[PDB]
């Protein structure tokens, strides 16, 4: 007898909301992974759909994430978290 929804859910497609998360291109691949796995676990985690900016994208530093407004928000916080951690290790290579 819980107030409203009792268990977790995915929601409706239309119900989902597209958001823009400011992600540095220096942490893009690092997050995406090799075959898109590192980003696969994150998506399923919050059940969202992260859409990285393509080469001809207007914002190569912004990623479009789809999904409920309650799940997306959480995903973002997790995204920026990895951004910093990764950045921390950014040194000017010889060439």
PDB file of C-alpha atoms in Angstrom:
ATOM      1  CA  UNK A   1       0.000   0.000   0.000  1.00  0.00           C
ATOM      2  CA  UNK A   2       2.370   2.695  -1.236  1.00  0.00           C
ATOM      3  CA  UNK A   3       1.259   6.160  -2.344  1.00  0.00           C
ATOM      4  CA  UNK A   4       1.087   5.877  -6.122  1.00  0.00           C
ATOM      5  CA  UNK A   5       3.708   3.951  -8.080  1.00  0.00           C
ATOM      6  CA  UNK A   6       5.186   1.179  -5.934  1.00  0.00           C
ATOM      7  CA  UNK A   7       8.023  -0.175  -8.055  1.00  0.00           C
ATOM      8  CA  UNK A   8      10.388   1.303 -10.631  1.00  0.00           C
ATOM      9  CA  UNK A   9       9.454   1.807 -14.283  1.00  0.00           C
ATOM     10  CA  UNK A  10      10.691   3.070 -17.650  1.00  0.00           C
ATOM     11  CA  UNK A  11       7.826   5.373 -18.578  1.00  0.00           C
ATOM     12  CA  UNK A  12       6.378   6.321 -21.956  1.00  0.00           C
ATOM     13  CA  UNK A  13       8.380   7.313 -25.036  1.00  0.00           C
ATOM     14  CA  UNK A  14       6.541  10.611 -25.497  1.00  0.00           C
ATOM     15  CA  UNK A  15       6.691  11.149 -21.735  1.00  0.00           C
ATOM     16  CA  UNK A  16      10.475  11.271 -22.095  1.00  0.00           C
ATOM     17  CA  UNK A  17      12.115  14.699 -22.281  1.00  0.00           C
ATOM     18  CA  UNK A  18      15.198  15.727 -24.256  1.00  0.00           C
ATOM     19  CA  UNK A  19      17.837  17.679 -22.336  1.00  0.00           C
ATOM     20  CA  UNK A  20      21.210  19.237 -23.150  1.00  0.00           C
ATOM     21  CA  UNK A  21      24.225  18.348 -21.007  1.00  0.00           C
ATOM     22  CA  UNK A  22      27.457  20.367 -21.349  1.00  0.00           C
ATOM     23  CA  UNK A  23      30.177  17.764 -21.891  1.00  0.00           C
ATOM     24  CA  UNK A  24      33.755  18.531 -22.927  1.00  0.00           C
ATOM     25  CA  UNK A  25      34.998  16.849 -26.105  1.00  0.00           C
ATOM     26  CA  UNK A  26      38.069  15.859 -24.090  1.00  0.00           C
ATOM     27  CA  UNK A  27      35.915  13.487 -22.039  1.00  0.00           C
ATOM     28  CA  UNK A  28      33.595  12.390 -24.845  1.00  0.00           C
ATOM     29  CA  UNK A  29      35.391   9.269 -26.070  1.00  0.00           C
ATOM     30  CA  UNK A  30      36.682   8.493 -22.577  1.00  0.00           C
ATOM     31  CA  UNK A  31      33.030   8.117 -21.583  1.00  0.00           C
ATOM     32  CA  UNK A  32      31.740   6.577 -24.812  1.00  0.00           C
ATOM     33  CA  UNK A  33      34.254   3.775 -24.354  1.00  0.00           C
ATOM     34  CA  UNK A  34      35.573   1.458 -27.055  1.00  0.00           C
ATOM     35  CA  UNK A  35      32.486  -0.075 -28.663  1.00  0.00           C
ATOM     36  CA  UNK A  36      30.027   2.178 -26.857  1.00  0.00           C
ATOM     37  CA  UNK A  37      29.955   0.114 -23.672  1.00  0.00           C
ATOM     38  CA  UNK A  38      31.082   2.653 -21.074  1.00  0.00           C
ATOM     39  CA  UNK A  39      28.081   4.691 -22.217  1.00  0.00           C
ATOM     40  CA  UNK A  40      25.813   1.649 -22.468  1.00  0.00           C
ATOM     41  CA  UNK A  41      25.953   0.980 -18.725  1.00  0.00           C
ATOM     42  CA  UNK A  42      25.142   4.620 -17.985  1.00  0.00           C
ATOM     43  CA  UNK A  43      22.087   4.610 -20.249  1.00  0.00           C
ATOM     44  CA  UNK A  44      20.590   1.438 -18.774  1.00  0.00           C
ATOM     45  CA  UNK A  45      21.448   2.742 -15.305  1.00  0.00           C
ATOM     46  CA  UNK A  46      18.951   5.602 -15.551  1.00  0.00           C
ATOM     47  CA  UNK A  47      17.169   4.063 -18.538  1.00  0.00           C
ATOM     48  CA  UNK A  48      18.002   7.102 -20.670  1.00  0.00           C
ATOM     49  CA  UNK A  49      19.240   7.654 -24.223  1.00  0.00           C
ATOM     50  CA  UNK A  50      22.441   9.690 -24.498  1.00  0.00           C
ATOM     51  CA  UNK A  51      23.032  11.179 -27.947  1.00  0.00           C
ATOM     52  CA  UNK A  52      26.566  12.473 -28.498  1.00  0.00           C
ATOM     53  CA  UNK A  53      27.165  15.320 -30.985  1.00  0.00           C
ATOM     54  CA  UNK A  54      28.174  14.118 -34.451  1.00  0.00           C
ATOM     55  CA  UNK A  55      31.098  15.542 -36.422  1.00  0.00           C
ATOM     56  CA  UNK A  56      28.784  17.926 -38.247  1.00  0.00           C
ATOM     57  CA  UNK A  57      26.979  18.647 -34.987  1.00  0.00           C
ATOM     58  CA  UNK A  58      26.251  22.268 -33.985  1.00  0.00           C
ATOM     59  CA  UNK A  59      27.566  21.622 -30.476  1.00  0.00           C
ATOM     60  CA  UNK A  60      30.536  19.212 -30.335  1.00  0.00           C
ATOM     61  CA  UNK A  61      30.637  19.878 -26.592  1.00  0.00           C
ATOM     62  CA  UNK A  62      26.968  19.160 -25.886  1.00  0.00           C
ATOM     63  CA  UNK A  63      25.113  15.847 -25.672  1.00  0.00           C
ATOM     64  CA  UNK A  64      21.371  15.315 -26.084  1.00  0.00           C
ATOM     65  CA  UNK A  65      19.980  12.939 -23.460  1.00  0.00           C
ATOM     66  CA  UNK A  66      16.469  11.508 -23.742  1.00  0.00           C
ATOM     67  CA  UNK A  67      14.228  10.070 -21.043  1.00  0.00           C
ATOM     68  CA  UNK A  68      11.954  11.066 -18.169  1.00  0.00           C
ATOM     69  CA  UNK A  69      12.773  14.369 -16.417  1.00  0.00           C
ATOM     70  CA  UNK A  70      13.357  12.464 -13.177  1.00  0.00           C
ATOM     71  CA  UNK A  71      15.747   9.934 -14.711  1.00  0.00           C
ATOM     72  CA  UNK A  72      17.574  12.320 -17.043  1.00  0.00           C
ATOM     73  CA  UNK A  73      18.453  14.785 -14.284  1.00  0.00           C
ATOM     74  CA  UNK A  74      20.149  11.952 -12.395  1.00  0.00           C
ATOM     75  CA  UNK A  75      22.025  10.844 -15.513  1.00  0.00           C
ATOM     76  CA  UNK A  76      23.470  14.329 -15.991  1.00  0.00           C
ATOM     77  CA  UNK A  77      24.929  14.541 -12.486  1.00  0.00           C
ATOM     78  CA  UNK A  78      26.627  11.230 -13.278  1.00  0.00           C
ATOM     79  CA  UNK A  79      27.940  12.554 -16.594  1.00  0.00           C
ATOM     80  CA  UNK A  80      29.574  15.722 -15.265  1.00  0.00           C
ATOM     81  CA  UNK A  81      31.040  13.593 -12.474  1.00  0.00           C
ATOM     82  CA  UNK A  82      33.090  11.567 -14.956  1.00  0.00           C
ATOM     83  CA  UNK A  83      34.005  14.740 -16.842  1.00  0.00           C
ATOM     84  CA  UNK A  84      36.041  16.206 -13.983  1.00  0.00           C
ATOM     85  CA  UNK A  85      37.645  12.931 -12.901  1.00  0.00           C
ATOM     86  CA  UNK A  86      38.836  12.374 -16.470  1.00  0.00           C
ATOM     87  CA  UNK A  87      39.882  15.983 -17.057  1.00  0.00           C
ATOM     88  CA  UNK A  88      42.088  15.797 -13.964  1.00  0.00           C
ATOM     89  CA  UNK A  89      44.305  13.638 -16.176  1.00  0.00           C
ATOM     90  CA  UNK A  90      44.819  16.002 -19.112  1.00  0.00           C
ATOM     91  CA  UNK A  91      48.434  16.814 -19.919  1.00  0.00           C
ATOM     92  CA  UNK A  92      49.932  18.428 -23.040  1.00  0.00           C
ATOM     93  CA  UNK A  93      51.545  15.493 -24.844  1.00  0.00           C
ATOM     94  CA  UNK A  94      54.770  16.033 -26.787  1.00  0.00           C
ATOM     95  CA  UNK A  95      52.990  15.661 -30.114  1.00  0.00           C
TER      96      UNK A  95
END
